[PDB]
């Protein structure tokens, strides 16, 4: 798991976190996670320990040792935790939940209580860390995007569309374009002004892409920044070229038959180390490794009793 | 105990209402005699003398017999029922059979399987003909639940309008809009729903795209009359007369006369009214109106009397079912 | 008013226009009503302006003069409007009560009020009897004496319309309320004294039936155990326990009380003795002994409680069994026009319904020979239900007045409600009806379908559903709905209906009544519409709503399991309507009802404001909060925005069809539905 | 007389159907009871129906 350069952790409602192997696709080990499911998995940049976000507790499991107990279980939160960030330094951990209060935690510090709190109006559905390590993107059920500066605490509230729940938002590593997605299925993209010290971070709306008809769950830019994956409840993970915003590849898990209702949602997207492959989770209990250019299931991961709702992927050397 | 039953089933030699009624009486009496339940079997002698006794016990006797039959007499009886319903249909026998079918639907046994789909279509046609619009709506709704089609929607709208439910019919149109867009919606639906403005728009676009046709012309003209735009109606009438065949001319004359009367062009009004057939209530009414305009009071009174004589049938038929 | 709006310049011109209109037509009701409403609005506007400016000496006196100058015209116009209307004066009467209770302490306003009271007929005041009695103990003696005189007249003419609420007032904990009630009652006794005595004994015996001594001990011991083992509040423990011992001190009065004293009375007295020993000593060993006895009797009464299926009057209260041919009128039945239906006799047996509150099933016999069944509710306030029923009466009158609503036969099913105390009261029992939950359960049992199939499916997919996030919840809910056929209600309706014609009539009535109650409930801010809280009539098919415990967005405000659904619009009801869905009868009826209510926004606002500003009903708002005036103003503003159509967006006004569409989308939205408490049955 | 009836109907005016409105179990037995009990029930109902009135003088 930890020794292997590729880490792929998958979990859902079954109270277990399973670390698969990309080369083979065999469950190396499982970690128990009781009292709740997991809402989001994330590997620290240092790769020392993974983090699991569930309900009211933020657990962090070791990656190198096998079969450990939760090393850190940050309690003291209510109303679930939707997603978790991670500072590149590895000092600060960013989290957000439905209590409308994004929280900043110090891993090095012993203090159980968080360090900084950003309270908003609507429940927080996503949190994303800008690559510059100076601003935090916070979504909400009301659809108001907030850009929380980590140094001046000047939050700029922007609402792309009134009264629509924003579900996920991500920014490419180059900070060129930012994508946000809501329950309507639209994929809003904003150009980022080249400002670091001035903190202007002005968002210029570029295009409103009708990505999906039903609820859209998650989006993420590829490391090369030329690709943007977008999942939804339509059981189709759509892929758009950043230069043109056109559907180059459509990854669908549809049964190909009208006699099939509610096969399972798809809310997972993870580009490979060089963006050749893409890992996608699904509610069919089966994660799938797709080929970006061809759009075929190179390998399939199975063994989860209940629906798969999270994923992890990291090719750092 | 199925010989006289089979004879009653596969007889099919009735050419009169009394013959089919006698078949119904024989069927009811035989069902009472063959009924397994002694309580039902005891009323056969009374039902022979009194027909309402047989009619009231018809459903229970049929249930007992149908439960007894080992699916083969059931098949034969079902086929006989299909023959009776489809061929030589009669109002009383049809109503009795429809009540039987409703009773079976209510019972735990299940509906009688008639020509597949439990005879949803055939029962709907029969209920509509016998003016049991509630049953017709129920069967048509079941057909809709099995599958929605524009024909089913049209029949549903017609049944609802005949049932004095314009709100429900408008809901049907809304469903048609959301699911089938606009092409599948014929302007006749708006015309039935009295959404005359929407019907007028639909007729205008259909005329713009598809070449002018007598049916579209008549539909748009009807919408014009309903709105009251006599100027446009009369303009269309004057524009298209020699291009019109005689049947479409007879259909034209009524609306043309209405427009001419609205505008006060009495010469055109007389021209159109002469073309209206005499055997129509509207024709008699407009002839009387012209007689009043020309002060031909005696001929007006005679024509009004003829109009009432014609209205006898329509008024009686409509007053037969509710006010 | 529509164009310029409301401000300093508009009021004098509008007053001139309305005064000239009244001068040109004295007998016109609309002119006088509009003039009075305009003056009342001007009074409110000036009051709010002075509140916003001065609060945030001479200015106060200037406002006093200006408001007094604007008030008397309002009072006179309202009185003349009532006299002209003669039958549709509910709004005007409530406005009169508001002006009276607010500015009646001024001698000039009091003079206008007394003159208007003398001119007006007494029959009108029967409509606002609860509002009048809500302010029996108003601190202002000038207003109080006029209220007392008016109620004395109401006692003289139509005494039966006052005896029940007067009796309820007489037994109030606060001294002033019971003092005023007894002061009115002594004057009434010189008139009859017999309606008085009968009403008193009836109310006492009915309360005794509603709550039995062992039941009082059970609930008190439950609160006591929560106080001690949960909160360690020994002083509150003694405060809760002592009234029960004080009620023991009266001694047994009936066979049931004697038996309870024989069985438990000795143990309770012992426990009180040990409590007193603890009081003088403070010993855990002294208190634990009383605790052991309390838990012993608690277990005994807990075992005995299920066996109390039915209550016979000879044990519980032989006085009611004695009652025969009482002149006392049947509750909720007196009408100034119809003959008085006086009680003939009370049935000896009461069939207790096995519910959490254990409501009795009382049934009286009237002089006309027709049984009147009622439900005896204990430990629950019914004044809120009384005000809600008054509002429903107004809405029914408005719907009857409207031609389209009258054509469609739109109406709200209502039942007589008669409060008996702060805890207990009487509820009219509607016949030929059953809870939607009961119908669903019976049909599913008949069809061998698991009752909680949807919950079992969602739990199987995700055992952590309650702790799932929003998107996981909605996905789970969608899976459960898709993999379940939600036609149980429609199928059971069709099976229950005898013939297709009656079936169609029933379905039409069901859809229309459901739409009417949905719109009225949304305007009223009524929530917590779980299937047990609404009932379906098995003959007419009309929808009925009961248990208006939460109103004015209480479910939305409460932090635990908040409800985001304005009114219950679940998929099973949607299927129970026409096959097309909501786009037909439901939507059109909603359009008509919303149009009618928006038309009569002034009347609806008057009715709502009266019992929102009522002090006796402010405890609900205070409990919801976490002062009083800001909360009342806020909720009134919210409902005003609902009626105007600016609720969804303050800046943008919304028309009736668009607002109805948005309400339907909000009610049917899966994201909004999956937030609802599982017991509310969103999947159903 | 048909003409006169129609004429007087027209003279009195085409009344609004709502104005006219304001001017003015065996299947349930099957739904409640099982078949074995239902058969005597419907039998007895019909027999009582004959039993009342003067048709009894014949049957």
Swiss-Prot record, chain A:
Broadly expressed, with highest levels in skeletal muscle, heart and kidney. The keyword Transcription does not apply. WD repeats lie at residues 1-30, 33-73, 76-115, 119-158, 161-200, 211-250, 261-302. It holds the Pfam family WD40. There is a cross-link at residue 306 (Glycyl lysine isopeptide (Lys-Gly) (interchain with G-Cter in SUMO1)). Gene3D superfamilies: YVTN repeat-like/Quinoprotein amine dehydrogenase. The keyword Cell inner membrane does not apply. It is found in: Lysosome membrane; Cytoplasm. Changing residue 298 to R: Elevated assembly of mTORC2 complex. Decreased sumoylation. One of its GO terms (biological process) is cytoskeleton organization. Belongs to the WD repeat LST8 family. This is Target of rapamycin complex subunit LST8. The gene is MLST8.
Swiss-Prot record, chain B:
Autophosphorylates when part of mTORC1 or mTORC2. Phosphorylation in the kinase domain modulates the interactions of MTOR with RPTOR and AKT1S1/PRAS40 and leads to increased intrinsic mTORC1 kinase activity. TPR repeats lie at residues 86-122, 123-148, 149-182, 183-213, 214-247, 248-281, 282-314. Changing residue 199 to D: In FCORD2; somatic mutation; increased TOR signaling. It is found in: Lysosome membrane; Endoplasmic reticulum membrane; Golgi apparatus membrane; Cell membrane. Signal peptide: none annotated. Changing residue 223 to R: In FCORD2; somatic mutation; increased TOR signaling; increased kinase activity. HEAT repeats lie at residues 14-51, 52-85. Expressed in numerous tissues, with highest levels in testis. The modification Phosphoserine is found at residue 1. Belongs to the PI3/PI4-kinase family. The kinase domain (PI3K/PI4K) is intrinsically active but has a highly restricted catalytic center. It is linked to Smith-Kingsmore syndrome: An autosomal dominant syndrome characterized by intellectual disability, macrocephaly, seizures, umbilical hernia, and facial dysmorphic features. Part of the mechanistic target of rapamycin complex 1 (mTORC1) which contains MTOR, MLST8 and RPTOR. The mTORC1 complex is a 1 Md obligate dimer of two stoichiometric heterotetramers with overall dimensions of 290 A x 210 A x 135 A. It has a rhomboid shape and a central cavity, the dimeric interfaces are formed by interlocking interactions between the two MTOR and the two RPTOR subunits. Serine/threonine protein kinase which is a central regulator of cellular metabolism, growth and survival in response to hormones, growth factors, nutrients, energy and stress signals. MTOR directly or indirectly regulates the phosphorylation of at least 800 proteins. Functions as part of 2 structurally and functionally distinct signaling complexes mTORC1 and mTORC2 (mTOR complex 1 and 2). This is Serine/threonine-protein kinase mTOR. The chain holds residues 1261 to 1583 of 2549 of the full protein.
């Amino acid at each position: 798991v930890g020794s292997d350069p590729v880490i792929l952790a998958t979990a859902g409602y079954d109270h277990t976190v399973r670390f698969w192997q990309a080369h083979s696709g065999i469950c190396t080990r499982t970690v128990q996670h009781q009292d709740s499911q997991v809402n989001a998995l994330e590997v620290t940049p240092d790769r020392s320990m993974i983090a699991a976000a569930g309900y009211q507790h933020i657990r962090m499991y070791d990656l190198n040792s096998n079969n450990p107990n939760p090393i850190i279980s940050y309690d003291g939160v209510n109303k679930n935790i939707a997603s978790v960030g991670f500072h590149e330094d590895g000092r600060w951990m960013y989290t957000g939940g439905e209590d409308c209060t994004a929280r900043i935690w110090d891993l090095r510090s012993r203090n159980l209580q968080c360090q900084r709190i950003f309270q908003v109006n609507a429940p927080i559905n996503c949190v994303c860390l800008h690559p510059n390590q100076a601003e935090l993107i916070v979504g909400d059920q009301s659809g108001a995007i907030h850009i929380w500066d980590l140094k001046t605490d000047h939050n700029e509230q922007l609402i792309p569309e009134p009264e629509v729940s924003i579900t996920s938002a991500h920014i490419d590593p180059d900070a060129s374009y930012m994508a946000a997605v809501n329950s309507t299925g639209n994929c809003y993209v904003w150009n980022l002004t080249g400002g670091i010290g001035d903190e202007v971070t002005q968002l210029i709306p570029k295009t409103k892409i009708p990505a999906h008809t039903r609820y859209a769950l998650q989006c993420r830019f590829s490391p090369d920044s030329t690709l943007l994956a977008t999942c939804s409840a339509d059981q189709t993970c759509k892929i758009w070229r950043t230069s043109n915003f056109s559907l180059m590849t459509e990854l669908s898990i549809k049964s190909g038959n009208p006699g099939e209702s509610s096969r399972g949602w798809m809310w997972g997207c993870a580009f490979s180390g060089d963006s050749q492959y893409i890992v996608t989770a699904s509610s069919d209990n089966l994660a799938r490794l797709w080929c970006v250019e061809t759009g075929e299931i190179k390998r399939e991961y199975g063994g989860h009793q209940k629906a798969v709702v999270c994923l992890a992927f990291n090719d750092s050397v | 105990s199925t010989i006289n039953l089979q004879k009653a089933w596969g007889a099919a030699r009735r050419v009169s209402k009394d013959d089919w009624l006698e078949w119904l009486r024989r069927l009811s009496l035989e069902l009472l005699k063959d009924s397994s339940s002694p309580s039902l079997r005891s009323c056969w002698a009374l039902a022979q003398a009194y027909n309402p006794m047989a009619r009231d016990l018809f459903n229970a006797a049929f249930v007992s017999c149908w439960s007894e039959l080992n699916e083969d007499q059931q098949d034969e009886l079902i086929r006989s029922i299909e023959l009776a319903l489809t061929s030589q249909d009669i109002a009383e026998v049809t109503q009795t059979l429809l009540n039987l079918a409703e009773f079976m639907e209510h019972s735990d046994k299940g509906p009688l399987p008639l020509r597949d789909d439990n005879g949803i279509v055939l029962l709907g046609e029969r209920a509509a003909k016998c003016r049991a619009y509630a049953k017709a709506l129920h069967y048509k709704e079941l057909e809709f639940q099995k599958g929605p089609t524009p024909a089913i929607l049209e029949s549903l709208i017609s049944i609802n309008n005949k049932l004095q439910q314009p709100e429900a019919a408008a809901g049907v149109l809304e469903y048609a809009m959301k699911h089938f867009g606009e092409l599948e919606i014929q302007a006749t639906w708006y015309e039935k729903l009295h959404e005359w403005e929407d019907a007028l728009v639909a007729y205008d676009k259909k005329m713009d795209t598809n070449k002018d046709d007598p049916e579209l012309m008549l539909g748009r003209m009807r919408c014009l009359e309903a709105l009251g735009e006599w100027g446009q109606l009369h303009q269309q009438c004057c524009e298209k007369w020699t291009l019109v065949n005689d049947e479409t001319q007879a259909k034209m004359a009524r609306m043309a006369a209405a427009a001419a009367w609205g505008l006060g062009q009495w010469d055109s009004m007389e021209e159109y009214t002469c073309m209206i057939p005499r055997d129509t209530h509207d024709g008699a009414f407009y002839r009387a109106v012209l007689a009043l305009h020309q002060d031909l009071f005696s001929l007006a009174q005679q024509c009004i009397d003829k109009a009432r004589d014609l209205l006898d049938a329509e008024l009686t038929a409509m007053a037969g079912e509710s006010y | 008013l529509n164009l310029q709006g409301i401000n300093e310049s508009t009021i004098p011109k509008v007053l001139q226009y309305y005064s000239a209109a009244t001068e040109h037509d004295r007998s016109w009701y609309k002119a006088w009503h509009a003039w009075a409403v305009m003056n009342f609005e001007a009074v409110l506007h000036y009051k709010h302006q002075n509140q916003a400016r001065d609060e945030k000496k001479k200015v106060t006196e200037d406002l006093s003069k200006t408001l007094l100058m604007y008030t008397v015209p309002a009072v006179q116009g309202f009185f003349r409007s009532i006299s002209l209307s003669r039958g549709n004066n509910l709004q005007d009467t409530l406005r009169v009560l508001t002006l009276w209770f607010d500015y009646g302490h001024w001698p000039d306003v009091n003079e206008a009020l007394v003159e208007g009271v003398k001119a007006i007929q007494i029959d009108t005041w029967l409509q606002v009897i609860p509002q009048l009695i809500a302010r029996i103990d108003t601190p202002r003696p000038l207003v109080g004496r006029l209220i007392h005189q008016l109620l004395t007249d109401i006692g003289r003419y139509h005494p039966q319309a006052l005896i029940y609420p007067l009796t309820v007032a007489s037994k109030s904990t606060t001294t002033a309320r019971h003092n005023a009630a007894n002061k009115i009652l002594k004057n009434m006794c010189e008139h009859s004294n017999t309606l008085v005595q009968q009403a008193m004994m009836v109310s006492e015996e009915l309360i005794r039936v509603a709550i039995l001594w062992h039941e009082m001990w059970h609930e008190g011991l439950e609160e006591a155990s929560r106080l001690y083992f949960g909160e360690r509040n020994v002083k509150g423990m003694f405060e809760v326990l002592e009234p029960l011992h004080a009620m023991m001190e009266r001694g047994p009065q009936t066979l049931k009380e004697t038996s309870f004293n024989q069985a438990y009375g000795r143990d309770l007295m012992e426990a009180q003795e040990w409590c007193r020993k603890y009081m003088k000593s403070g010993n855990v060993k002294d208190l634990t002994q009383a605790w052991d006895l309390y838990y012993h009797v608690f277990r005994r009464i807990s075992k005995q409680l299920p066996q109390l299926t039915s209550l016979e009057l000879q044990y519980v209260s032989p006085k009611l069994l004695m009652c025969r041919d009482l002149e006392l009128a049947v509750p909720g039945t007196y009408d100034p026009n119809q003959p008085i239906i006086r009680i003939q006799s009370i049935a000896p047996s009461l069939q207790v319904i096995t519910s959490k509150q254990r409501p009795r099933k009382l049934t009286l016999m009237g002089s006309n020979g027709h049984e009147f069944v009622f439900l005896l509710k204990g430990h629950e306030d019914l004044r809120q239900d009384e005000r809600v029923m008054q509002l429903f009466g107004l809405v029914n009158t408005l719907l009857a007045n409207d031609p389209t609503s009258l054509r469609k036969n739109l109406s709200i099913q209502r039942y007589a409600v008669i409060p008996l105390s702060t805890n207990s009261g009487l509820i009219g029992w509607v016949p030929h009806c059953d809870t939607l939950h009961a119908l669903i359960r019976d049909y599913r049992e008949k069809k061998k379908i698991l009752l909680n199939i949807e919950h079992r499916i969602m739990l199987r997919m995700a055992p952590d559903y309650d702790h799932l996030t929003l998107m996981q919840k909605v996905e789970v809910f969608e899976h459960a709905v898709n993999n379940t056929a939600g036609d149980d209600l429609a199928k059971l309706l069709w099976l229950k209906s005898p013939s297709s014609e009656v079936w169609f009539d029933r379905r039409t009535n069901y859809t229309r009544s459901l739409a009417v109650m949905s719109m009225v409930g949304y305007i009223l801010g009524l929530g917590d519409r779980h299937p047990s809280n609404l009932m379906l009539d098995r003959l007419s098919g009309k929808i009925l709503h009961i248990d208006f415990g939460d109103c004015f967005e209480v479910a939305m405000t409460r932090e635990k399991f908040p409800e985001k659904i304005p009114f219950r619009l679940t998929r099973m009801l949607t299927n129970a309507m026409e096959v097309t869905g909501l786009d037909g009868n439901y939507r059109i009826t909603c359009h008509t009802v919303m149009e009618v209510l928006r038309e009569h926004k002034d009347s609806v606002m008057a009715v709502l404001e009266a019992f929102v500003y009522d002090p006796l009903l402010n405890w609900r708002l205070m409990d919801t909060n976490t002062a009083l005036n800001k909360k009342a103003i806020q909720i009134i503003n919210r409902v005003r925005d609902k009626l105007t159509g600016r609720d969804f967006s303050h800046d943008d006004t919304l028309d009736v069809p668009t607002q109805v569409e948005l309400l339907i989308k909000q009610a049917t939205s899966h994201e909004n539905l999956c937030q609802c408490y599982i017991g509310w049955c969103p999947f159903w | 007389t048909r003409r006169e009836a129609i004429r007087v109907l027209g003279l009195l005016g085409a009344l609004d159907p709502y104005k006219h409105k304001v001017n003015i179990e065996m299947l349930v037995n099957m739904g409640n009871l099982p078949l074995d009990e239902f058969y005597p029930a419907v039998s007895m109902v019909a027999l009582m129906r004959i039993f009342r009135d003067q048709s009894l003088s014949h049957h």
